[PDB]
Design an enzyme around this catalytic site. Sequence first.
Site, PDB file in Angstrom:
ATOM      1  N   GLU A  60     -11.056  59.542 -17.368  1.00  0.00           N
ATOM      2  CA  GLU A  60     -12.249  60.465 -17.904  1.00  0.00           C
ATOM      3  C   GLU A  60     -12.104  61.662 -18.108  1.00  0.00           C
ATOM      4  O   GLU A  60     -12.587  62.559 -19.825  1.00  0.00           O
ATOM      5  CB  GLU A  60     -13.790  60.200 -17.346  1.00  0.00           C
ATOM      6  CG  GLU A  60     -14.755  60.628 -17.964  1.00  0.00           C
ATOM      7  CD  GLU A  60     -15.836  61.121 -17.305  1.00  0.00           C
ATOM      8  OE1 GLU A  60     -15.959  62.176 -16.139  1.00  0.00           O
ATOM      9  OE2 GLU A  60     -17.156  60.128 -17.704  1.00  0.00           O
ATOM     10  N   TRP A  82     -18.190  54.552 -19.590  1.00  0.00           N
ATOM     11  CA  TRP A  82     -18.986  54.844 -20.864  1.00  0.00           C
ATOM     12  C   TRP A  82     -18.485  53.726 -22.009  1.00  0.00           C
ATOM     13  O   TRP A  82     -19.370  54.034 -22.787  1.00  0.00           O
ATOM     14  CB  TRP A  82     -18.238  55.966 -22.021  1.00  0.00           C
ATOM     15  CG  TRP A  82     -17.891  57.484 -21.550  1.00  0.00           C
ATOM     16  CD1 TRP A  82     -17.539  57.616 -20.428  1.00  0.00           C
ATOM     17  CD2 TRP A  82     -19.407  58.314 -22.008  1.00  0.00           C
ATOM     18  NE1 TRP A  82     -17.952  59.304 -19.779  1.00  0.00           N
ATOM     19  CE2 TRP A  82     -18.803  59.591 -21.202  1.00  0.00           C
ATOM     20  CE3 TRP A  82     -20.488  58.540 -22.590  1.00  0.00           C
ATOM     21  CZ2 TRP A  82     -19.478  60.274 -20.663  1.00  0.00           C
ATOM     22  CZ3 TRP A  82     -20.704  59.243 -22.659  1.00  0.00           C
ATOM     23  CH2 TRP A  82     -20.674  60.405 -21.865  1.00  0.00           C
ATOM     24  N   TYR A 108     -19.092  65.562 -24.647  1.00  0.00           N
ATOM     25  CA  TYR A 108     -18.509  66.224 -24.288  1.00  0.00           C
ATOM     26  C   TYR A 108     -17.082  66.067 -25.602  1.00  0.00           C
ATOM     27  O   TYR A 108     -16.570  67.775 -25.362  1.00  0.00           O
ATOM     28  CB  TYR A 108     -17.411  65.934 -23.012  1.00  0.00           C
ATOM     29  CG  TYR A 108     -18.920  65.603 -21.804  1.00  0.00           C
ATOM     30  CD1 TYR A 108     -19.383  66.943 -21.748  1.00  0.00           C
ATOM     31  CD2 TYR A 108     -19.726  64.544 -21.215  1.00  0.00           C
ATOM     32  CE1 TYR A 108     -20.615  66.296 -20.590  1.00  0.00           C
ATOM     33  CE2 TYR A 108     -20.622  64.393 -20.924  1.00  0.00           C
ATOM     34  CZ  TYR A 108     -21.161  65.824 -20.429  1.00  0.00           C
ATOM     35  OH  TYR A 108     -22.136  65.622 -19.514  1.00  0.00           O
ATOM     36  N   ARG A 149     -18.917  85.879 -19.159  1.00  0.00           N
ATOM     37  CA  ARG A 149     -18.842  85.495 -20.446  1.00  0.00           C
ATOM     38  C   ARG A 149     -17.728  83.802 -20.238  1.00  0.00           C
ATOM     39  O   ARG A 149     -18.087  83.248 -21.832  1.00  0.00           O
ATOM     40  CB  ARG A 149     -18.840  85.903 -22.088  1.00  0.00           C
ATOM     41  CG  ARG A 149     -19.779  87.194 -21.679  1.00  0.00           C
ATOM     42  CD  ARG A 149     -19.450  88.846 -20.769  1.00  0.00           C
ATOM     43  NE  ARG A 149     -19.792  89.534 -21.894  1.00  0.00           N
ATOM     44  CZ  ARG A 149     -19.476  90.043 -22.648  1.00  0.00           C
ATOM     45  NH1 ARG A 149     -18.100  90.060 -23.587  1.00  0.00           N
ATOM     46  NH2 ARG A 149     -19.996  91.331 -23.447  1.00  0.00           N
ATOM     47  N   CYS A 168     -25.293  65.087 -19.203  1.00  0.00           N
ATOM     48  CA  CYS A 168     -25.748  65.928 -17.450  1.00  0.00           C
ATOM     49  C   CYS A 168     -25.120  66.925 -17.633  1.00  0.00           C
ATOM     50  O   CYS A 168     -25.880  67.665 -16.871  1.00  0.00           O
ATOM     51  CB  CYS A 168     -25.435  64.629 -16.686  1.00  0.00           C
ATOM     52  SG  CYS A 168     -26.036  62.510 -16.722  1.00  0.00           S
ATOM     53  N   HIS A 169     -24.419  67.569 -18.046  1.00  0.00           N
ATOM     54  CA  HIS A 169     -23.173  68.585 -17.862  1.00  0.00           C
ATOM     55  C   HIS A 169     -23.740  69.440 -18.471  1.00  0.00           C
ATOM     56  O   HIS A 169     -22.866  69.252 -19.821  1.00  0.00           O
ATOM     57  CB  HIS A 169     -21.738  67.990 -17.008  1.00  0.00           C
ATOM     58  CG  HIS A 169     -21.982  67.185 -16.115  1.00  0.00           C
ATOM     59  ND1 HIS A 169     -22.634  67.193 -14.583  1.00  0.00           N
ATOM     60  CD2 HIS A 169     -20.879  65.500 -16.456  1.00  0.00           C
ATOM     61  CE1 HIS A 169     -22.429  65.929 -14.464  1.00  0.00           C
ATOM     62  NE2 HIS A 169     -21.449  65.823 -15.471  1.00  0.00           N
ATOM     63  N   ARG A 188     -27.631  69.080 -15.306  1.00  0.00           N
ATOM     64  CA  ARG A 188     -29.311  69.084 -15.630  1.00  0.00           C
ATOM     65  C   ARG A 188     -30.635  67.208 -15.107  1.00  0.00           C
ATOM     66  O   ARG A 188     -31.484  67.924 -14.949  1.00  0.00           O
ATOM     67  CB  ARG A 188     -30.082  68.884 -17.488  1.00  0.00           C
ATOM     68  CG  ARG A 188     -29.397  67.504 -18.131  1.00  0.00           C
ATOM     69  CD  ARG A 188     -30.106  67.623 -19.104  1.00  0.00           C
ATOM     70  NE  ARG A 188     -29.255  66.217 -19.707  1.00  0.00           N
ATOM     71  CZ  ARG A 188     -29.671  64.575 -19.490  1.00  0.00           C
ATOM     72  NH1 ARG A 188     -31.130  64.414 -19.016  1.00  0.00           N
ATOM     73  NH2 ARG A 188     -28.674  63.943 -19.946  1.00  0.00           N
ATOM     74  N   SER A 189     -29.285  67.022 -14.791  1.00  0.00           N
ATOM     75  CA  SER A 189     -29.773  65.540 -14.148  1.00  0.00           C
ATOM     76  C   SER A 189     -28.906  65.276 -13.534  1.00  0.00           C
ATOM     77  O   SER A 189     -27.875  64.227 -13.519  1.00  0.00           O
ATOM     78  CB  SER A 189     -30.822  64.399 -15.420  1.00  0.00           C
ATOM     79  OG  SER A 189     -30.571  63.023 -14.945  1.00  0.00           O
ATOM     80  N   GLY A 190     -29.632  64.485 -12.114  1.00  0.00           N
ATOM     81  CA  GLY A 190     -28.273  64.361 -10.915  1.00  0.00           C
ATOM     82  C   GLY A 190     -29.240  62.996 -10.095  1.00  0.00           C
ATOM     83  O   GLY A 190     -29.826  62.892  -9.711  1.00  0.00           O
ATOM     84  N   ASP A 191     -27.879  61.862 -10.583  1.00  0.00           N
ATOM     85  CA  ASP A 191     -28.369  60.454 -10.070  1.00  0.00           C
ATOM     86  C   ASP A 191     -27.391  60.813  -8.770  1.00  0.00           C
ATOM     87  O   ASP A 191     -26.443  60.431  -8.414  1.00  0.00           O
ATOM     88  CB  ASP A 191     -27.679  59.463 -10.699  1.00  0.00           C
ATOM     89  CG  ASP A 191     -27.641  57.761  -9.770  1.00  0.00           C
ATOM     90  OD1 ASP A 191     -28.041  57.977  -8.117  1.00  0.00           O
ATOM     91  OD2 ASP A 191     -27.739  57.016 -10.376  1.00  0.00           O
ATOM     92  N   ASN A 199     -19.487  63.600 -10.415  1.00  0.00           N
ATOM     93  CA  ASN A 199     -19.607  64.605 -10.894  1.00  0.00           C
ATOM     94  C   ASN A 199     -18.746  65.671 -10.079  1.00  0.00           C
ATOM     95  O   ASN A 199     -18.113  66.054 -10.876  1.00  0.00           O
ATOM     96  CB  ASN A 199     -21.439  64.777 -11.224  1.00  0.00           C
ATOM     97  CG  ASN A 199     -22.301  63.735 -12.312  1.00  0.00           C
ATOM     98  OD1 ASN A 199     -23.274  63.517 -11.752  1.00  0.00           O
ATOM     99  ND2 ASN A 199     -21.561  62.771 -12.981  1.00  0.00           N
ATOM    100  N   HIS A 229     -32.474  63.573  -8.213  1.00  0.00           N
ATOM    101  CA  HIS A 229     -32.913  62.509  -7.773  1.00  0.00           C
ATOM    102  C   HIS A 229     -32.461  61.218  -7.325  1.00  0.00           C
ATOM    103  O   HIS A 229     -31.924  60.388  -7.470  1.00  0.00           O
ATOM    104  CB  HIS A 229     -33.734  61.684  -9.541  1.00  0.00           C
ATOM    105  CG  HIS A 229     -33.317  61.881 -10.110  1.00  0.00           C
ATOM    106  ND1 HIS A 229     -32.821  62.560 -11.321  1.00  0.00           N
ATOM    107  CD2 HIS A 229     -32.679  60.574 -10.505  1.00  0.00           C
ATOM    108  CE1 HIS A 229     -32.119  61.559 -12.567  1.00  0.00           C
ATOM    109  NE2 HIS A 229     -31.780  60.479 -12.295  1.00  0.00           N
ATOM    110  N   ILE A 230     -33.184  60.411  -6.649  1.00  0.00           N
ATOM    111  CA  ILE A 230     -31.866  59.071  -6.075  1.00  0.00           C
ATOM    112  C   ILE A 230     -33.211  58.442  -6.073  1.00  0.00           C
ATOM    113  O   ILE A 230     -34.800  57.840  -6.353  1.00  0.00           O
ATOM    114  CB  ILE A 230     -32.628  59.987  -4.352  1.00  0.00           C
ATOM    115  CG1 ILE A 230     -31.781  60.300  -3.736  1.00  0.00           C
ATOM    116  CG2 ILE A 230     -32.508  58.093  -3.638  1.00  0.00           C
ATOM    117  CD1 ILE A 230     -32.309  60.977  -1.936  1.00  0.00           C
ATOM    118  N   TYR A 231     -33.193  57.583  -7.006  1.00  0.00           N
ATOM    119  CA  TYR A 231     -33.445  55.861  -7.231  1.00  0.00           C
ATOM    120  C   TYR A 231     -33.185  54.973  -5.799  1.00  0.00           C
ATOM    121  O   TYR A 231     -33.620  55.385  -5.129  1.00  0.00           O
ATOM    122  CB  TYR A 231     -32.431  54.885  -7.881  1.00  0.00           C
ATOM    123  CG  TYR A 231     -32.868  55.678  -9.484  1.00  0.00           C
ATOM    124  CD1 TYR A 231     -33.301  55.029 -10.484  1.00  0.00           C
ATOM    125  CD2 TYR A 231     -31.048  56.396 -10.226  1.00  0.00           C
ATOM    126  CE1 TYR A 231     -33.292  55.583 -12.032  1.00  0.00           C
ATOM    127  CE2 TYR A 231     -31.382  57.567 -11.170  1.00  0.00           C
ATOM    128  CZ  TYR A 231     -32.454  56.863 -11.782  1.00  0.00           C
ATOM    129  OH  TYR A 231     -32.386  56.912 -13.685  1.00  0.00           O
TER     130      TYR A 231
END
Lengths: 279, 287
Positions: A60, A82, A108, A149, A168-169, A188-191, A199, A229-231
Amino acid sequence: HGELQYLGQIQHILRCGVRKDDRTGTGTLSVFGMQARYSLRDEFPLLTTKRVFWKGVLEELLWFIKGSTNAKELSSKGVKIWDANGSRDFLDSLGFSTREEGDLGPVYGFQWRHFGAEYRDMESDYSGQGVDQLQRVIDTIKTNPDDRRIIMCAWNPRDLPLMALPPCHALCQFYVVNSELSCQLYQRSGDMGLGVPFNIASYALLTYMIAHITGLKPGDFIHTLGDAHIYLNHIEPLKIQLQREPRPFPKLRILRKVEKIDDFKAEDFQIEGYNPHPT
Amino acid sequence: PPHGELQYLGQIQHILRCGVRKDDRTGTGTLSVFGMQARYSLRDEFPLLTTKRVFWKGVLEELLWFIKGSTNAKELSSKGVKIWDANGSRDFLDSLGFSTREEGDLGPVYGFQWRHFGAEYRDMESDYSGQGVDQLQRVIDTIKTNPDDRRIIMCAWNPRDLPLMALPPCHALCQFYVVNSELSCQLYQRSGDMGLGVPFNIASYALLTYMIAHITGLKPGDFIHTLGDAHIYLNHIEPLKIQLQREPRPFPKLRILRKVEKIDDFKAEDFQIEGYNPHPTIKMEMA
C-alpha cells in the site's frame, strides 16, 4: 514497552468511550482525541498481540509513493484492501458511472505527488503538475532540518467529492533533532480493532523510508487520533487480545542503500524476529 | 477534579526538563518536544489562562476577522489588534518577494482557506463569492444534519497556496465531533510558541467551538489541543519560571448575550467574559 500504549488506548475506550453510531449504523464505543508515542529506535512497531498484515502495509505504501490511484494496481500485488471502493457498483453508487473500475479518484497517491493539480482519471499523466509534497518533505529534511512546516497533507477539501473515500490520514508532520527523524500522524478516524495496527505500521514504515533517504535515524512515531473507536462486535475479541503479553517488537532491515524514495521495492525490506500471537 | 490550566503548566514543565535544544529561522533557539496533547473541558467553564493574562480582545477580533474571510491585516488593525501587522508591512512583504502586493495583504491565509479553499487567490480586496469550498459553513451544516460524521474538518493547510502566504498557518486543521449533544473540537497545531502563542491559541479554538455550539444548538464539550513542534524560546525560560510559581484561579465563563442564527452575524458585543481573574501579565520578547 511500546505496544502497551495501543493496549492502554483500547482499555481507555472500553472503560470511558461512549455509544455512537457510524455511517453504516453498526455502532461503536468512542473517544475523541487520543495520542500515543511509539519509539522507532532499534525496534519497529509491528503489533505482536495480534498479527498485522505486513505485506498489505508495505505494498500500500509503495502504491502511494508511485502516485497511483488505481485499486487494480494494488490488487495485482495481492492486496485487496481498496478493491471494494473501486468496484463498478461502489463507483456507480457515488454517481461516477463514467469512471473505469479501480479508479478511486484523487486519493493519497495523487495528493502526496500532485496536490492541487486537476484530477482527470487514474491513467492520466500528472508529471510536473501540482505540489509534490513527498519530495518537498524529503528536500526540506535534507536542507533545513529545523523547519516546523514539514507537512504532507492528504486532506484536500476541493477534491473530497471526487474521492471514493475521504482519507482517514488527514496529514502527517515530520521533525528533526539530534539526527533523529520523527513523524506525527493526524488520523481523523480510527478503527482500533482492525485499522489502527495497520495504520501505525504504515507511518512507522514511511518514517523508516524517509530516514534512510535522508541519512537520519528513526526517532518517534506519534499517533494522534480524532474519533477513536471500537466496533461493538469487536469488544469480545479485543477482551481476549488484552490478555496477551506483548513479545518484543521486531526490527526492520533495509537491505541495500537507496537514493530516491521512488526506488524502494518490496524486496528491499525485511521484518526480523516478528513473533505474533495467533489471529 | 484538577484545574484545566495545570495541563498547560505541566506541558511547560515537561519541555523545561525534557525538551532538547533546537534552533529556529531566527537562530534564537528553543527547548523543544515533538508531539503533545492536552484536553480542556468547555462544560460551564472557558479555558482563558489565569497564570498570565491572555489578550482576549485579540482572540475575539482575530476570530471574527477570520470568519469574514478577510486576509487584510489593516482590517484587523482597525479593531485595535496589531498581531498580524508586521506580517503585512511593506518591508515584510518585500522580503518575501511580494513587491507588487498592497500593504496589509497577507495572501491566502485563514480567512480565505476557511471560506474559499481551493479558489484562485488574486488579492485581499477581490470578491470570492461562491468560489472555492466554504469549509466553515459545510462544518456547521454537517454538524446540524449528520452529527455522527467523522469528517467534520476545516483545513487551513493548502500546499498549493503556501508560497503566496505571508506566513504558513500554525493551525493546520481542526476537527469537530458530536456525542450526547456535546460539540468537541481538536486542533492540529504544527508549531507552538508555549510562552507567547499557545494560551492565545487555546482561547481561539475554544471560542470557535462556543460559536459553532451556539449556532447548532449544542453544548460545548472538550477542546483537544494537539501540538507538533512544542517549544519554549530560551529568552522565555526565566519569565516562565516565574509563571510556573503561580496558582491558577478558577476559569472564567463565556456568556453569549443574544440568540445568533448564522456564524457571520456574531459581533464582538455578543460575547462576555465573566469572572476572569488573571495574575499580572508577564514580560516576554518575540522571534
